[PDB]
Amino acid sequence: IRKKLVIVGDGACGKTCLLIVNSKDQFPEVYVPTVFENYVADIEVDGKQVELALWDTAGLEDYDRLRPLSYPDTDVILMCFSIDSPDSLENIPEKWTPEVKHFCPNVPIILVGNKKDLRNDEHTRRELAKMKQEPVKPEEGRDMANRIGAFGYMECSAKTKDGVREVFEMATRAALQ
Numbered sequence: 422i423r424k425k426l427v428i429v430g431d432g433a434c435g436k437t438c439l440l441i442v443n444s445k446d447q448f449p450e451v452y453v454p455t456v457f458e459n460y461v462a463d464i465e466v467d468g469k470q471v472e473l474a475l476w477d478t479a480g481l482e483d484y485d486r487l488r489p490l491s492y493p494d495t496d497v498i499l500m501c502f503s504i505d506s507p508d509s510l511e512n513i514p515e516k517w518t519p520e521v522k523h524f525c526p527n528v529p530i531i532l533v534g535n536k537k538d539l540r541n542d543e544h545t546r547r548e549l550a551k552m553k554q555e556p557v558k559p560e561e562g563r564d565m566a567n568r569i570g571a572f573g574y575m576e577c578s579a580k581t582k583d584g585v586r587e588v589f590e591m592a593t594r595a596a597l598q
Protein backbone atom coordinates (compact mmCIF):
# COMPACT_ATOMS: atom_id res chain seq x y z
CA ILE A 422 0.00 0.00 0.00
CA ARG A 423 1.39 3.39 -1.01
CA LYS A 424 0.13 6.68 0.40
CA LYS A 425 1.24 10.28 -0.02
CA LEU A 426 1.76 12.72 2.86
CA VAL A 427 2.39 16.47 2.37
CA ILE A 428 3.67 18.60 5.25
CA VAL A 429 2.94 22.34 5.38
CA GLY A 430 3.27 25.22 7.85
CA ASP A 431 5.20 28.39 8.71
CA GLY A 432 8.85 28.71 8.01
CA ALA A 433 11.18 27.22 10.59
CA CYS A 434 8.31 25.60 12.48
CA GLY A 435 10.07 22.18 12.38
CA LYS A 436 8.63 20.37 9.37
CA THR A 437 11.85 19.03 7.91
CA CYS A 438 13.26 17.97 11.29
CA LEU A 439 10.04 16.05 11.99
CA LEU A 440 10.23 14.13 8.70
CA ILE A 441 13.96 13.38 9.16
CA VAL A 442 13.78 12.15 12.77
CA ASN A 443 10.99 9.85 11.66
CA SER A 444 12.76 8.52 8.52
CA LYS A 445 16.52 8.69 9.14
CA ASP A 446 16.79 8.81 12.95
CA GLN A 447 19.20 11.76 12.61
CA PHE A 448 18.46 15.37 13.73
CA PRO A 449 19.83 17.77 11.11
CA GLU A 450 22.68 20.00 12.29
CA VAL A 451 22.19 23.13 10.09
CA TYR A 452 18.84 25.02 9.56
CA VAL A 453 18.43 25.17 5.85
CA PRO A 454 15.08 26.46 4.49
CA THR A 455 13.35 23.91 2.30
CA VAL A 456 12.62 24.51 -1.34
CA PHE A 457 11.09 21.06 -1.81
CA GLU A 458 12.18 17.60 -0.75
CA ASN A 459 11.05 13.97 -0.71
CA TYR A 460 11.53 11.21 1.84
CA VAL A 461 10.01 7.75 2.39
CA ALA A 462 8.92 6.00 5.58
CA ASP A 463 7.66 2.45 5.99
CA ILE A 464 5.05 2.22 8.72
CA GLU A 465 2.71 -0.52 9.93
CA VAL A 466 -0.67 0.28 11.54
CA ASP A 467 -3.50 -2.06 12.46
CA GLY A 468 -1.49 -4.78 10.76
CA LYS A 469 -1.44 -2.78 7.52
CA GLN A 470 1.88 -2.39 5.66
CA VAL A 471 2.27 1.19 4.29
CA GLU A 472 4.93 2.94 2.28
CA LEU A 473 4.45 6.62 3.14
CA ALA A 474 5.87 9.11 0.64
CA LEU A 475 6.81 12.23 2.63
CA TRP A 476 6.61 15.38 0.58
CA ASP A 477 8.38 18.28 2.30
CA THR A 478 7.42 21.83 1.37
CA ALA A 479 8.61 25.38 1.92
CA GLY A 480 7.31 27.58 4.68
CA LEU A 481 9.08 30.60 3.21
CA GLU A 482 6.94 33.01 1.19
CA ASP A 483 9.75 33.09 -1.36
CA TYR A 484 8.46 29.70 -2.50
CA ASP A 485 4.69 30.13 -2.28
CA ARG A 486 4.20 29.59 -6.00
CA LEU A 487 6.24 26.34 -5.93
CA ARG A 488 4.50 24.76 -2.91
CA PRO A 489 1.19 23.91 -4.66
CA LEU A 490 3.06 21.59 -7.08
CA SER A 491 3.35 19.17 -4.20
CA TYR A 492 -0.41 18.85 -3.61
CA PRO A 493 -1.67 16.55 -6.38
CA ASP A 494 -3.10 13.25 -5.23
CA THR A 495 -2.31 13.71 -1.57
CA ASP A 496 -3.69 11.19 0.94
CA VAL A 497 -2.99 13.06 4.22
CA ILE A 498 -1.70 16.51 5.23
CA LEU A 499 0.41 17.28 8.26
CA MET A 500 -0.36 20.95 8.96
CA CYS A 501 2.16 22.24 11.44
CA PHE A 502 2.89 25.17 13.75
CA SER A 503 5.49 25.51 16.49
CA ILE A 504 4.58 25.54 20.16
CA ASP A 505 7.26 28.21 20.65
CA SER A 506 5.43 30.55 18.24
CA PRO A 507 1.82 31.60 18.94
CA ASP A 508 1.75 33.45 15.63
CA SER A 509 2.49 30.22 13.80
CA LEU A 510 -0.77 28.87 15.25
CA GLU A 511 -2.64 32.03 14.32
CA ASN A 512 -1.43 31.52 10.75
CA ILE A 513 -3.17 28.13 10.53
CA PRO A 514 -6.58 29.65 9.67
CA GLU A 515 -5.02 32.73 8.06
CA LYS A 516 -3.00 30.98 5.39
CA TRP A 517 -2.53 27.21 5.74
CA THR A 518 -6.12 26.05 5.88
CA PRO A 519 -7.31 28.31 3.03
CA GLU A 520 -4.50 27.03 0.86
CA VAL A 521 -4.93 23.33 1.65
CA LYS A 522 -8.71 23.55 1.37
CA HIS A 523 -8.35 24.94 -2.12
CA PHE A 524 -5.84 22.44 -3.50
CA CYS A 525 -6.84 19.36 -1.42
CA PRO A 526 -10.40 20.16 -0.21
CA ASN A 527 -11.38 16.74 1.26
CA VAL A 528 -7.98 15.35 2.29
CA PRO A 529 -7.66 14.67 6.04
CA ILE A 530 -5.58 17.12 8.04
CA ILE A 531 -3.57 16.35 11.17
CA LEU A 532 -2.83 19.62 13.02
CA VAL A 533 0.60 19.16 14.58
CA GLY A 534 2.30 21.30 17.23
CA ASN A 535 6.05 20.96 16.89
CA LYS A 536 8.84 21.79 19.29
CA LYS A 537 6.97 20.56 22.36
CA ASP A 538 10.30 20.54 24.18
CA LEU A 539 10.22 24.35 24.20
CA ARG A 540 6.98 24.70 26.19
CA ASN A 541 8.93 24.58 29.45
CA ASP A 542 12.13 26.16 28.08
CA GLU A 543 13.23 29.20 30.08
CA HIS A 544 14.70 31.13 27.14
CA THR A 545 11.56 30.62 25.13
CA ARG A 546 9.29 31.70 27.96
CA ARG A 547 11.39 34.78 28.68
CA GLU A 548 11.52 35.82 24.98
CA LEU A 549 7.82 35.42 24.50
CA ALA A 550 6.99 37.23 27.74
CA LYS A 551 8.56 40.28 26.11
CA MET A 552 5.56 40.31 23.74
CA LYS A 553 3.20 39.33 26.58
CA GLN A 554 2.98 35.90 25.00
CA GLU A 555 3.77 32.38 26.10
CA PRO A 556 4.09 29.01 24.40
CA VAL A 557 1.04 27.58 22.76
CA LYS A 558 -1.09 25.63 25.23
CA PRO A 559 -2.31 22.18 24.29
CA GLU A 560 -5.86 23.36 24.76
CA GLU A 561 -5.29 26.12 22.20
CA GLY A 562 -3.92 23.71 19.62
CA ARG A 563 -6.80 21.32 20.15
CA ASP A 564 -9.35 24.17 19.87
CA MET A 565 -7.82 25.16 16.53
CA ALA A 566 -7.92 21.52 15.35
CA ASN A 567 -11.62 21.48 16.00
CA ARG A 568 -12.17 24.87 14.37
CA ILE A 569 -10.52 23.81 11.10
CA GLY A 570 -12.07 20.36 11.00
CA ALA A 571 -8.87 18.41 11.43
CA PHE A 572 -8.84 14.64 11.66
CA GLY A 573 -6.75 14.95 14.79
CA TYR A 574 -4.44 17.14 16.91
CA MET A 575 -0.96 15.94 17.92
CA GLU A 576 2.09 17.44 19.63
CA CYS A 577 5.66 16.32 19.25
CA SER A 578 9.31 17.12 19.65
CA ALA A 579 11.64 16.11 16.81
CA LYS A 580 14.49 17.04 19.14
CA THR A 581 13.63 14.48 21.84
CA LYS A 582 11.40 12.24 19.67
CA ASP A 583 8.42 12.63 22.06
CA GLY A 584 5.25 11.92 20.12
CA VAL A 585 6.85 11.60 16.70
CA ARG A 586 5.86 8.00 16.13
CA GLU A 587 2.26 8.72 17.03
CA VAL A 588 2.05 11.61 14.57
CA PHE A 589 2.95 9.32 11.66
CA GLU A 590 0.78 6.46 12.95
CA MET A 591 -2.19 8.83 13.03
CA ALA A 592 -1.34 10.27 9.64
CA THR A 593 -1.17 6.77 8.17
CA ARG A 594 -4.51 5.79 9.70
CA ALA A 595 -5.99 8.93 8.24
CA ALA A 596 -4.46 8.21 4.85
CA LEU A 597 -5.90 4.69 4.84
CA GLN A 598 -9.48 5.68 5.65
Ligand SMILES: Nc1nc2c(ncn2[C@@H]2O[C@H](COP(=O)(O)OP(=O)(O)NP(=O)(O)O)[C@@H](O)[C@H]2O)c(=O)[nH]1
Nearest residue numbers: 432433434435436437438452454455480536579580
Ligand atom coordinates in the same frame (compact mmCIF):
# COMPACT_ATOMS: atom_id res chain seq x y z
N1 LIG B 1 13.93 22.91 20.12
C1 LIG B 1 13.54 22.38 18.94
N2 LIG B 1 13.99 22.91 17.82
C2 LIG B 1 13.57 22.26 16.70
C3 LIG B 1 12.71 21.19 16.63
N3 LIG B 1 12.48 20.83 15.32
C4 LIG B 1 13.18 21.66 14.59
N4 LIG B 1 13.86 22.55 15.39
C5 LIG B 1 14.75 23.63 14.96
O1 LIG B 1 14.03 24.62 14.27
C6 LIG B 1 14.72 25.09 13.09
C7 LIG B 1 13.85 24.89 11.87
O2 LIG B 1 13.52 23.51 11.71
P1 LIG B 1 13.13 22.93 10.29
O3 LIG B 1 12.63 21.56 10.47
O4 LIG B 1 14.24 23.10 9.33
O5 LIG B 1 11.94 23.86 9.89
P2 LIG B 1 11.02 23.92 8.62
O6 LIG B 1 9.62 24.06 9.08
O7 LIG B 1 11.36 22.74 7.77
N5 LIG B 1 11.44 25.23 7.78
P3 LIG B 1 11.21 25.63 6.23
O8 LIG B 1 9.76 25.85 6.08
O9 LIG B 1 11.99 26.89 6.06
O10 LIG B 1 11.74 24.45 5.44
C8 LIG B 1 16.03 24.33 13.01
O11 LIG B 1 17.01 25.18 13.61
C9 LIG B 1 15.73 23.13 13.90
O12 LIG B 1 16.88 22.64 14.57
C10 LIG B 1 12.22 20.61 17.82
O13 LIG B 1 11.46 19.64 17.95
N6 LIG B 1 12.69 21.30 18.94
Ligand SMILES: [Mg+2]
Nearest residue numbers: 436437454455
Ligand atom coordinates in the same frame (compact mmCIF):
# COMPACT_ATOMS: atom_id res chain seq x y z
MG1 LIG C 1 12.04 22.56 5.86
Ligand SMILES: [Mg+2]
Nearest residue numbers: 508511512515
Ligand atom coordinates in the same frame (compact mmCIF):
# COMPACT_ATOMS: atom_id res chain seq x y z
MG1 LIG D 1 -0.45 36.00 10.19
